[PDB]
C-alpha cells in the first residue's frame, strides 16, 4: 500500500466536489505544518553552510506561504470551507512536529525537509486524481503546478544532501 | 487585576534574563495565534467593504508575521528557544480561537480584531516593564515599537467601526 | 438543460478543430460586450464604495481585455478568423446591454457583475470540453487559467454582496 | 461643405453646455469604433513590417483607450451621459467598419488608419470651435491636445507610407 | 449675484497684471485654508469606510499642496508676492473653518469637501476670466488644470455621497 | 529660567496623559506654524546659492510635514484631538511670523531658520521628559527621534553658516 | 507517416517513465541546436529589417534557452541525465546546421526560422502524447506551454513572410 | 518699439499657417545656438558655486533640447520644413555667440543666460500672437508651455544673481 | 594619401600635448555636425521602415551627444578650450551638410550616415596615432571607445543596406 | 572586571556630555579599526565557503561603516570632534590587528570576527550606561540600535561557527 | 613550449587582420564549448555547498555569452565570418567535453573550471599578442577586458578549492 | 627630479611582476589614507557652500573605496598581498594626515583636496610606465581609468577654486 494510496483512503473516507474540497482542505492543513516546520529549521539551525541555508529557509516558507493562500482561496471559491485554527491544521495535518532543538544537525534539517516535500508531493497527486476523477480542471491545474515545484525543491534539496531526486 | 497585571503574573510564575525570554516566547505564541485570527477574516468574511477590508486583512498578517520574525529572532540572541510547533503556539497562546463560519458579520470581525491587538498591546506593556526590570534596551525597544504599531491599528480599526480608539 | 448545454449547442450549430474555432471566436464576441458592460458600471455607477468599486472596474476591465487579446490570437494561430467590428461582436454575443443610467444602484451593478462572469464560467467549460473533445490542448489551458480566473471574481463579487460563491 | 462643416452640423442637429455634451459624445462613439479598427489591423495584418507595426497597433489602441477614459469622464463630470454600449458606438459613430480579412495589404491597413486620424482631428476641431463658442475652457484644452496627438500620428502614420502630413 | 461674480468684485476690489496677481494670491490662501480642511477630515473621521476614505484625504492633500506650488511660484514669477504666513492665509481666505470633532459624521465630510471644490472651481472661473483679460497665457493655462482637476474631484466625491456632479 | 522650563510650565497650565497629549498639540501648532515659516524661505529668498538653498527647503519643508502627521495621529490614538484650523495652529504656537519680504538676506533666512530648529528642540526635550514622567515609551520614541532629527538640521544649517552647532 | 509518428518511434526507439525522459531528452539536443541556428541569424543576416529582426533573434534565443533550461532541470528531477556536450547535442538532435554565409537572404533566414519552430512544434506534441501516456502531468504542462509558445512564434513569423500560420 | 514687435516684424517679413510655420522656425534656430550657448557656461566657467551650477547647464540644455524636439516635430507636422544644418541655425538665429573663454566670470555666465531666456520668452509671446491669429490651437499650447518653462527660469535665475525676476 | 593621412596633416598643420589637444578639438567640431546631419534624417525622412528608423536616429544622436560630452570634457581637463560655438563647428568641421529635403530617399539617408561614421572611424585612428605619440593613454582610450562603437554601428547600418561592414 | 567596567574606566580617565562624547569617540575608532578587520577577512580568505562568506564581509563592511558614519555625526553635532586619521584610529582604538596572511582558516576568520562584534557590543553597552548616566535620549536610541544589530551578528556567526550566541 | 606559444602557433598555422580574425573565432569555438561545459556542472552537481555554487554557474553561465556576442560581433565588424555551428564549436575548440556523470565531486567541478579559465587566460593572451602585433586597438582591449574577468574568476574559484590564484 | 620620478624610485626600491605588485600596494596605502582625509573634510567642513560640498565629500569617498577594492582584489589576483591594517596605510602611505580642525576653511579643504588627487594621478601614472614595462595590460587598464577619473576630479575641484586644471 504506497503513500498515495494510503493519502486517497484517508481523504475521501468521511455535492459532485466532495473529494475536491477534502484534498483541498487536507492540503490548507499540511501547508499550515509544513510552514512552521520549515520556520522551526531557518530559527534552529547551527552549522557550516548556515548562512546560506537559513535565508533559504525563508524562500521556502514563502513559497509554502503562497501555495496555502491558492490552496484556501480555490477552497472557498469552490463552495468549501477551509480549516483556518492552529488546532484544525494541528489534528488533521498528516505531517508530525517535534519540540525545537539546536542539537539537531544540518544533514539532519535537510533530511526532514525532502520528507515534507516528498509528502507533499505525494498528496498533490492524490490531488491530481481526485480532480480528474471529478472533472475540476482549475483545480487540476493547481495541484499540477504545486506538485511540479514540490520535484524540484526535493531534486535540489537532495543534491545538496549528495543525492540524486529519489522520487 | 488588570490585563497587564494578570499577564505579568501567568509570563513570570513558571540566568539575569528569564522574564525577558518568557515575554518574548509568549509573544511567539500570541503572534502566531493572532496571525491565524487575522487569515480567518481574510477567508471567511462576506459582506459590503469587503473589496477593502479582505487586502487589509493581507496587509495586518504580513505585518504580524514581521513581528514574528523579529521577536523569535530577537529570543534566540538573547539565548533563548522559541516555540516551533503549532500545539505549542495553540497551548501557550492566551487567545483563543474558533472554527471558521461565513455567517460572522463584518461588524463581529472588526470587533475580533480590535480584542486581539488590545490583547496583544497589553503583552507588549508586560514586555516593556519586564525589560526595563531586566535592564534589556534592546528589547525594550522592539516591545515599544510592537506596542505603537498596535495601538495605530487599533486607532484606525476602531474608526472604521465609528469608534474612538479607547486604548 | 443547463447554460453549458445550451452554449455548446449554440456554439457547434452552424478541419479537425472548428469546434474549437467557433468557442474560442464565441469568446472574442462575449469578452468585447463584457468589456463595454464593466466600462457602464465604472462610468455610471453612484452610492458609498463609488471610490474603491470605481477602480475596481478598471481593474476588471484592464482583464478582460488581455483575456481578449489571448483569445484572438490563439484563433489567429491556429487558423481562425476573430470577429473584428462592434456589429459583429454585439450580433454574436449572448451577453445583452442596456443603455446606460444613473439610477441603478450599487448593488444592481454587482448583481449584473456576477451575471457575467456565472456567464462566462460556463463558456470557458464549453471551452474546456470542446478542446478536450478536438485535443487542442494548448486552447484548453487557456480556457482552464479564464475559468479559474472567473471564478475567483465570482467569489469576491459575491462576497462584496454578503454572498456566498454559488458556482 | 467641409468635414469639420458637416461634422458640426450633425453633431449639433439634434442648458448653457449642450453642444460641449454633444460633440464630446460623438467622440466616444468614434473613439470606441477607432480603437476596434485598430485591433482589427493588429490582427490581420500580413506582409513584411508585420513585426514593427503590430505592437505600434498596440501602442495606438492604448492611446485611443486613454482618449476614450477621458472624453467619457469628462462628459460624465460637466452633466451628461456617455453611450454606454457596443450598438450605441456603432450607430452613432461616423466611421464605418468592415469584416476582417487576411488579404488586406500593409499599405491598405495604413492608407485606413491614416483616414481614421485624419476624421479624428476634425472632429477634434469642431470640439473646439463648440467649446469656444460655449465657454468651456477645460473642454477645449482636452480637444487641444488629443487634435495635436491626432496630427503627429497622422505625421509618422503618413511618412512610413513615404508621404507628407497633408493636414 | 453669482458666486463667480462675488468672488470677482472681492478680488479686484483693492501694473498690466494686478488681477492676475490679485486672484493668484486669493487661491494662495484657499489652497492653504483647503488643505488644512482636508487635513482635519483625516484626523478626525469615524464611521463605514474609514479605511478607504482616510487615505483618499492624503491624496487629496497631496494634490492641493501641490497645486499651492504652482500657484506661489506662477505669483512670484510674474512679479507678485505670495501671502506665506498662517495669519494672512486665514484672513484673506474665503473658506471658513471649525473647530475639529469627533462627532461630524462621513456624510458631514464628504458635504464639506465638495462644498470646498465647487468654491475652489468659482475661483478658478475668475482666475480664467481675469487672465483672459489681462493677457496671461501662462496664468489661463494654470487655472484651466486647476479647474478641470476640480470638477473630476466633485464628480467622484458627489457619486460617492449618492448624487450625480451638479456643476 | 530656560526656554525647556519656560516651554513645560507653558505647556501644562491649563486622565493619566493629560501633559503627554498637550505636548503632542503643542507640536502640532508649532510644526504647522514652522512648515509655514520653511515654505517662506523657499519663496522669498535672493542671493547666491539660491539654486541649492531653494530646493533644501523643499527637503526641510517635507521633513516637517512628516513629523507633522506622526505627531498628529500619536495624539489621536493616545485619546487627544489636534488643533486643526489655521487660526488655533497661529494663537497657539509659540512661533512668531512676519510678513515675507524680498529684502531678506540669505545669512537672515538662514539666521531665523536655527532659531526655529532650536525652539523645536526644546520643545521636544520637555516632550521627553513629559513622556517619561507619565510613562508613555511609544510617545518618548516620537520626541527622540524627532529631537536628533533636528539636531542634525541644527548642525548642516550652522555649518553652512560657517558656525558650529551649539545646541 | 507524419512527422510526429516519425518523431514518436525514433525517440521510444532504443521505468515507469522512460519515454518521457527519452523526449525530454530528444528536447535538450533540439532546443541547443534551435539556439545555435537563431544565432546564426542574429549573425549573418544582412538587407532591409535588419534593424528590428536583429535583436527580434536575440528575444528568441533567450526564450529558446529558457526553454533547454526547463527541460533540461525537468528531466534532472525526475530521474534522468540531460545531454551536456556540444557533440552529443549535435549527434541526436534532427535538426541540422549548415555553414554560415552572409549571402542568405532575410526571406531565407524567416523560412528556416519557420522549419525549426514548426519542427520544435511537432517534438512538443510527441512530448505531449507520451506524458499522457506515462502520466506525467507536471512533464505535460511543460510540453503545452512550449507548444503554444512556438505556434504563436510560427504565426507571427509566418505573418512577416506575408503568409498565414499554416500549422 | 518693444522687443516681441520687433520679434514679429523680422519673423513676418518675407498658406493659411505660414507666419505659424515662419516662428516655429525661428524658434528652431534660436533653440539651437541658446543650446550651444548654455553648454559653453558649462565647459567654460569657473569659480565659487562650480559643482552646482555645472549640472544646473546640463538640466537646462536637456529643457532645451526637448523644446527643439518639440518645435521641429511640430513644424514638420502642419507642413513646414526646419532648419537642419548648423549654418542655417546661425545665420537665422537672432542670438549672437562669442568664442568661449574661462576668464567670463560666475555673474557674466548667469546675466548671458537671463538675456537668452529673455529673448525666447519674447519669441514665445510672438509665437502666442501668430497662432491665435491664425487660429492653430495645438502650436499656441506649445508656445503657452515653453512661455511658462522659460519665465519660471528667470525667475530662478534672477534669484541666484540677488535680484527678482523683471519680467 | 589615404584620409586618415589627409586628417593628421590637417589636425597637426597649425606643450607637449598640442597634437591632442588639436585632435580632441576635431572632435568637437566634426561630433556637432554629426549630430546636427543625424538629427536631420530624424526630421526629413520619408519611406517604408520610417516606423523603426526614426526612432534608431534618436539613439544615435544620444550617443554622439555623448562622445561630444566626454570629448569636450576631456580636451578642458588636460589644458584646452573647446570649439563652443556654431560658427566654429560649422568652420572646423570636415563634414560637410546640406539643406534638408524631404525628396531623399531612405537608402541615401543610410549611405550618408555610413559616411560620417566612416568618417569618424578615420578621426578616432588619428586620435590614437597622436594619443600614442604624445604618451597620453586616457584619450587613447576615450579614442579606442570611440572607434569601436563607430566600427559596430557602421555594422549594424551597412547590413540594413544589405552589405558587409567594409571597414 | 568585566570587560563592560573595564572600557567604562578607561573611556572616562582622562561639559555635561564630556563622557558621551568620549564614548562616541572611542567608537570612532573601533569602527574604522573593525571595518579594517572585516576587509582583512574579504581580501585573505581561502577555503570552502569562500563563495558566500566573502560578499559577506562586504555587507558586514557597509554595515559598520554606516555605524561609523551615525557616530561621527553624531558626536560632531552634540558638539565633539571626532578622531579623523588613520593614526588616531589605530592609537586610541582597543582592537589590534595583525598582518594579513592567506594562511588563516576560515574558521580562524568567523572567530575573529566573532570577537570584533563581542567587544563593539560591550563599547555600545557602555555607550547605554554613559547616555543614561548623562541624560542624551538620541545617543542612547543610536547605542541602543547598534548593540541589537551586534547581537544579531554575533548570533548569525556563531550559528555558522555551529555554536550558541553566547552573549 | 608554453601554453600560449602553442595556442599561438596553432591559431595562427593555417588581409592585415588574419591573425585577429583567427584569433578571435578560436575565441568563437572555445567560448561556446566552455559555455557548455559550465551548464553541466550547473546540472550534474551533488554535494554541500550546491546552493549557492549551482546559482554561481548560472553567473558564469551568462558572463561567457556575454563575452561570446561581444567577440562574434567584433569579428563580423573587423570583417570576419564567426562559426555558428555546434559541429564547428565542437571541433575548432582546444578545450575538450566528456559526458555528463553524476559521480563527479564538488572539487571535480571546481578543479575543471579552473582549467577552463586558465585556458581561456592564456587565448586571451595571444589575443593581446597578435592585435598589438596588428594594430587592432578595439580588439586588443576587448582580450585585455576578457583576460582581467577570466582572471578574477580563477582567483575567486581557487580561493574557494583553499588555494591562491597561482595564474 | 619630478614626483613621477621620486615615486617610481621609492616605489621599486626595496617574479615578473614584482614591480607591478609593488605599486598597487602602494595604492592600497594611499587610497586608504585619500578617504581618511576626504571623510575629515566631510566631518569639519564650516561655511557658506557647506550643504552642496558636504555631499560631494561622500561621492569623492564611494569612488575612492571602489578604487581601493578594484586595486586590493587586482593585487591579490597577481599573486600579491595587500596592506590590511591601519598601521601599514599609514606607514607606508605618501600622503601625510593632520589632526581635525574646524578652523580650516572650504578654501582650505578645496586645496588639500587638490593635492590629493594630484599625487593620486602622479601615482597612477607610474603605476602606466610599470605595467608597460612589465607587461601588465589588465593593470594597465585599471591605471589608466584611475588616472582618467583623477585628472576629471582635478578638473571640477580646481574650477570650484576659480582656477584651471593646471595638470
Redesign the interface.
Given at each position: 500500500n504506497t503513500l498515495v494510496e494510503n493519502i486517497y483512503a484517508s481523504v475521501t473516507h468521511n455535492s459532485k466536489n466532495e473529494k475536491t474540497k477534502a484534498v483541498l482542505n487536507q492540503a490548507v492543513a499540511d501547508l499550515?505544518?509544513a510552514a512552521?516546520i520549515v520556520?522551526?529549521v531557518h530559527?534552529?539551525?547551527?552549522?557550516?553552510?548556515?548562512?546560506?541555508?537559513?535565508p533559504?529557509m525563508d524562500e521556502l516558507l514563502d513559497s509554502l506561504n503562497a501555495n496555502l493562500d491558492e490552496v484556501?482561496?480555490r477552497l472557498?471559491?469552490?463552495?468549501g470551507?477551509?480549516?483556518?485554527?492552529?488546532?484544525?491544521?494541528?489534528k488533521h495535518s498528516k505531517l508530525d512536529?517535534?519540540?525545537?532543538?539546536?542539537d539537531k544537525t544540518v544533514a539532519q534539517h535537510l533530511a526532514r525537509l525532502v520528507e515534507v516535500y516528498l509528502y507533499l508531493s505525494s498528496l498533490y497527486q492524490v490531488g491530481?486524481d481526485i480532480t480528474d476523477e471529478e472533472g475540476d480542471?482549475?483545480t487540476?491545474?493547481?495541484f499540477?503546478?504545486a506538485?511540479?515545484e514540490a520535484?524540484?525543491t526535493?531534486?535540489?534539496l537532495?543534491?545538496?544532501r549528495?543525492?540524486?531526486?529519489?522520487?
Open positions: 499550515s505544518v512552521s520556520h522551526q530559527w534552529y539551525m547551527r552549522g557550516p553552510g548556515f548562512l546560506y541555508l537559513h533559504k484556501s482561496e472557498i471559491t469552490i463552495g470551507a477551509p480549516y483556518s485554527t492552529l488546532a484544525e491544521f494541528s512536529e517535534a519540540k525545537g532543538t539546536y491530481l480542471a482549475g487540476n491545474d493547481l499540477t503546478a506538485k511540479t520535484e524540484k526535493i531534486w535540489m537532495q543534491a545538496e549528495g543525492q540524486g531526486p529519489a522520487l
